[PDB]
Design a protein around this ligand. Structure first.
Ligand SMILES: *[C@@H]1O[C@H](CO)[C@@H](O[C@@H]2O[C@H](CO)[C@@H](O)[C@H](O)[C@H]2NC(C)=O)[C@H](O)[C@H]1NC(C)=O
Ligand SMILES: *[C@@H]1O[C@H](CO)[C@@H](O[C@@H]2O[C@H](CO)[C@@H](O)[C@H](O)[C@H]2NC(C)=O)[C@H](O)[C@H]1NC(C)=O
Ligand SMILES: CCCCCCCCO[C@@H]1O[C@H](CO)[C@@H](O)[C@H](O)[C@H]1O
Ligand SMILES: CCCCCCCCO[C@@H]1O[C@H](CO)[C@@H](O)[C@H](O)[C@H]1O
Ligand SMILES: CC(C)Cc1ccc([C@H](C)C(=O)O)cc1
Ligand SMILES: CC(C)Cc1ccc([C@H](C)C(=O)O)cc1
Ligand SMILES: *[C@@H]1O[C@H](CO)[C@@H](O)[C@H](O)[C@H]1NC(C)=O
Ligand SMILES: *[C@@H]1O[C@H](CO)[C@@H](O)[C@H](O)[C@H]1NC(C)=O
Ligand SMILES: *[C@@H]1O[C@H](CO)[C@@H](O)[C@H](O)[C@H]1NC(C)=O
Ligand SMILES: *[C@@H]1O[C@H](CO)[C@@H](O)[C@H](O)[C@H]1NC(C)=O
Lengths: 557, 557
């Protein structure tokens, strides 16, 4: 019924119904005009000729290693490139946010209600004939069939880029601070009202939980020492709510910021490292400021760890994931003379695309043990038996799975993967090609162009019939990967805007915050600007073991 | 004890303790360097020579009426001036926000906790020797004595600018949507978690209250008709919580967005006008979109009324209050090529300076009745007896009191005025001269320079001894007014940054929102861009009576 169901407006023009069977497109500041915003302005069709494809840019960034070695050592030139990366990626994100799962039009409810995930594309209206608007059949293909035919893993497919379990668990630990779906309300709702990197997974979402976790001395968090090494406090000693099965011992009920981090020993590893890091910074600050009280010590340390996190995510995590030879840079100063909104709202589509289930291996290998999913889940005693040093040594060398390419979702989590498909449909996501156009990509003209092969493409065409009906999430997992890469084109061109915007949109990156006094002086400031994934492990893990997000990296001496 | 108690850092440099008896100033991006950020950079002392005083600028803006008539009719030039007004005023406001009543340093608690009012200046630390830091005596002078000697009204002093009760009640109705002090927690806390113009005083702070107020037909709010004219629904028919004394009839318990708007018939007048305006816009939208449902009709109308409000506040309310001959302009487009944060946090100091108690008259005059404060309070039957048309006619011609100048606070509200002084001290406000320097003003060297006279200045010197100890709020009320103006220098130079930032920092002013489709097409968009205080009354009050914020304005025909 709704005349906008066909998604007629192009180039980010907004569709509005003007009667029962008529629409109008708002082409304001899109660079286009005409009934569907498809006729380019003069300056627009000029930029369209010069603009290189995402695959062309990707090639240049992952080749010519010698040239980039020159660029990386020219500070003014490195700053210029990184500045363009930040601004060009951010422009794809609406800030202030607009639509959500219940609003295909802008409203004050959609803007102010922080319990929603925001939406990069408005949901398909309820009164549309087909799930994707007007194209395709009345029902989408069986999610169970899609899962079994192109998604399930027959044999483990390793990541060509060499991403290890240090990476996989960092990814899950880091993103679980702003990907906290409120399942009481629905998949379109969140419990992370910070909508970004506030480190609530360390300090707790609410003030009540924060105070239960704090020691109220030297600004430190509560802790216990087992075998000479520091671990999170117990549920008994703190009274914070954690999710543990009833058969778990009292001593092993670790209490951390996020309540689900007891699920995996891999998550509790990072929970422990950051806990040590917080208290480490506390003592350093107390050294500089013997006149400070507990409160200022805690708060300043939290700001520093926020800085450390963004520093690490950009210059180590994203750096590895990008595969670029260009040396990325965390420098808030780069945006001081640019137009940029220091705010961010977590998009539902960001949550969906980050469901990197193929990352998980068949077993978790520590020392000479091959723990299964059954053995690994909720077993914190594994962490105490081996210790963090052993965990780092083992996980640095265990490779993770290839996300794109298809048929690599471990069967142990097939229910979670199916849920990602169903909830995607429940939230009325638009098609893959609609999201590709949203992020300046050419739509796929066939299933073969999508997968880059024949066998999986044929299975999908039998299920979907039309390429313009193909769903976003399963496409991301079956998409033809870039040569020797972990991702396809769609994952990067969608993920990058969300990711970089969420990191730089933090208030500590704003000019009024980004100064030494905010972080307790030059010493505290330097902790942020020199932070790295290696230094984090080196300072907080026994023996200062070698670590990296890449199994391919040689360990010296 | 705290080495920063003396407020040593100048020009918005940040003070940090570096030991028990030492401090360091962060002069980053202040334009100054040196131990106290007082030594100008070369480019800084150049700008300092060219920059005219606030009083010089005020003179030029309130004189040369013939020249401004020329400027006002040159669109490109009018746009250029207004752009400079917006950007220069906004630069004085920290966005993202920083300090609050409990944090003299930046912290994540101060940033994320929306229940606080933010602070333009950090509070005086608890362990300081004197209330204002180091200067003055151990105790501030008796608030009751300050109130009676320089604040209380001996005889009504009318506003020279001619502000009427249409103005006074608009001011109280408008600002009560973001000045909602949570007295359960303290004076430093708020219930308006929108921190701006969200019109929660019309639609309710929470979704539950919003739904009780809505009709769920045509996007309209609930209403009743009495004597042919429309009024808000009752508490009985809606079950929303209103604050009424137990002796008020059932029919007279009007239910509106803000729960305290039953207090004054003047407030309920504007509550009624905006209620009619919402439903008026609903029908206009339904005309354009017969295919729209109740929800989209309500939401779009709310966005339009938000636009109308900001339009009216800038081009009528602030226009009158400023006394400028320059024709101000609400145009979000002016900031599209500028650096500006579309967000805002309500400052506690904004709340304090807006306590314009001298505005209130001795009696409220409607027709030939002279209602007292006792008779006027909670008496909605006054509103029904006379009607809105009568209210507008009478209030347009009744003059309000002069805010600055001193000795004009009505004795009926002396308790509220005293509370403003006490709570100001409780929240550990810094001195007047510290706030003047914060907003680029020269400190007052004596009490006589402050008041511009001798009698009140002498009374203050006996109470405070030092001019650098004079408090902010009582200074604002006794300050020497500009010639024939309602305010002194401090009220304008503090109020203007807060005010303009709060209006333009709204998300509907952002590029992604500011387009016809957001407001239901060109028709809805035009409602905003043509809105005025006269057209608001004309469209929603019987007979389309003449109205204005100035008693001096002649009524035609
Ligand atoms: C934000 O949106 C959610 C979802 O609509 C609101 O939660 C609803 O609240 C009403 C009553 O206020 C309940 O009857 C519904 O069951 C809730 N829905 C869901 C899905 O939980 C919420 O009230 C809105 N406002 C705020 C401030 O969160
Ligand atoms: C925001 O700040 C307020 C004030 O500190 C917090 O309210 C306190 O909450 C604790 C428990 O959470 C109570 O014991 C205190 O009595 C409260 N203080 C006041 C003054 O009301 C609030 O919890 C903070 N966090 C949020 C999310 O609002
Ligand atoms: C080659 C010099 C460094 C360029 C770094 C830019 C990397 C990200 O650039 C991206 O390019 C895409 C394709 O052009 C665009 O669609 C995106 O908007 C842009 O962010
Ligand atoms: C004369 C041409 C129009 C100028 C309009 C500027 C009005 C507000 O200008 C104000 O001037 C003050 C004193 O210089 C400054 O302290 C403020 O930062 C600035 O906002
Ligand atoms: C896909 C996303 C989650 C990770 C990612 C990968 C690459 C980049 C680079 C810096 C880019 O913006 O091109 C950013 C973020
Ligand atoms: C004092 C404040 C509450 C009202 C006010 C008065 C004047 C102005 C002008 C536009 C200015 O910025 O100079 C803005 C706001
Ligand atoms: C706009 O799109 C509609 C359907 O999406 C199509 O019928 C129409 O021809 C298009 N208009 C132009 C000018 O291309
Ligand atoms: C947890 O691991 C320990 C070895 O550290 C093992 O003995 C135990 O059986 C495991 N628990 C489960 C439920 O697999
Ligand atoms: C800075 O201020 C302190 C006290 O406020 C004063 O003693 C000192 O001399 C000042 N330093 C300079 C360089 O003016
Ligand atoms: C309210 O006003 C009416 C006149 O409209 C008057 O009769 C009544 O006494 C007033 N009530 C109070 C409490 O003053």
């Amino acid at each position: 019924a709704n005349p906008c169901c066909s998604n007629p407006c192009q180039n980010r023009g907004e569709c509005m119904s003007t009667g029962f069977d008529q629409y109008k497109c708002d082409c304001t500041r899109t660079g286009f005009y005409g009934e569907n915003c498809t006729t380019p302005e003069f300056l627009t069709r000029i930029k369209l000729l010069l603009k290189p494809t995402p695959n062309t840019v990707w090639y240049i960034l992952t080749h010519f290693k010698g040239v980039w070695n020159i660029v990386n050592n020219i500070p003014f030139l490195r700053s210029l490139i990184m500045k363009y990366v930040l601004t060009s990626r951010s422009y794809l994100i609406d800030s202030p946010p607009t639509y959500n799962v219940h609003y295909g039009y802008k409203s004050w409810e959609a803007f102010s209600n922080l319990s929603y995930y925001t939406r990069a594309l408005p949901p398909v209206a309820d009164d549309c004939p087909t799930p994707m608007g007007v194209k395709g059949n009345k029902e989408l293909p069986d999610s169970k069939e899609v899962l079994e035919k192109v998604l399930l893993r027959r044999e483990f497919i390793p990541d060509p880029q060499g991403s290890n379990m240090m990476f996989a668990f960092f990814a899950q630990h880091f993103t679980h601070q702003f990907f906290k779906t409120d399942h009481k309300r629905g998949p379109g709702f969140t419990r992370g009202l910070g909508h970004g990197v506030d480190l609530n997974h360390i300090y707790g979402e609410t003030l009540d939980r924060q105070h239960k976790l704090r020691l109220f001395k030297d600004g430190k968090l509560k802790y216990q020492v087992i075998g000479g090494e520091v671990y999170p406090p117990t549920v008994k000693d703190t009274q914070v709510e954690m999710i543990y099965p009833p058969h778990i011992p009292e001593n092993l009920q670790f209490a951390v910021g996020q309540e689900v981090f007891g699920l995996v020993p891999g998550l509790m590893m990072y929970a422990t490292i950051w806990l040590r890091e917080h208290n480490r910074v506390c003592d350093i600050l107390k050294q500089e400021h013997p006149e400070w009280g507990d409160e200022q010590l805690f708060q300043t340390s939290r700001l520093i760890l926020i800085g450390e996190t963004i520093k690490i995510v950009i210059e180590d995590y994203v750096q590895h994931l990008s595969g670029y030879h260009f040396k990325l840079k965390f420098d808030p100063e780069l945006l001081f003379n640019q137009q940029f909104q220091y705010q961010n709202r977590i998009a539902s589509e960001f949550n969906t695309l980050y469901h990197w289930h193929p990352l998980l291996p068949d077993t978790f290998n520590i020392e000479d043990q091959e723990y299964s999913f059954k053995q690994f889940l909720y077993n914190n005693s594994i962490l105490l038996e081996h210790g963090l040093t052993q965990f780092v040594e083992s996980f640095t060398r265990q490779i993770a799975g290839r996300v794109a390419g298809g048929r690599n979702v471990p069967i142990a989590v097939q229910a979670v993967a199916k849920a990602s498909i169903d909830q995607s449909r429940e939230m009325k996501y638009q098609s893959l090609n609609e999201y590709r156009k949203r992020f300046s990509l050419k739509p796929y003209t066939s299933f073969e162009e999508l997968t880059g092969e024949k066998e999986m493409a044929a299975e999908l065409k039998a299920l979907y019939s039309d390429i313009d009906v193909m769903e976003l999430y399963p496409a991301l997992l079956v998409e033809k990967p870039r040569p020797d890469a972990i991702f396809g084109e769609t994952m990067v061109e969608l993920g990058a805007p969300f990711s970089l915007k969420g990191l730089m949109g933090n208030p500590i990156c704003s000019p009024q915050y980004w100064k030494p006094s905010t972080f307790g002086g030059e010493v505290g400031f330097k902790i942020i600007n020199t932070a790295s994934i290696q230094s984090l492990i080196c300072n907080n893990v026994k023996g200062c073991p070698f670590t990296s997000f890449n199994v391919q990296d040689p360990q010296p001496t």
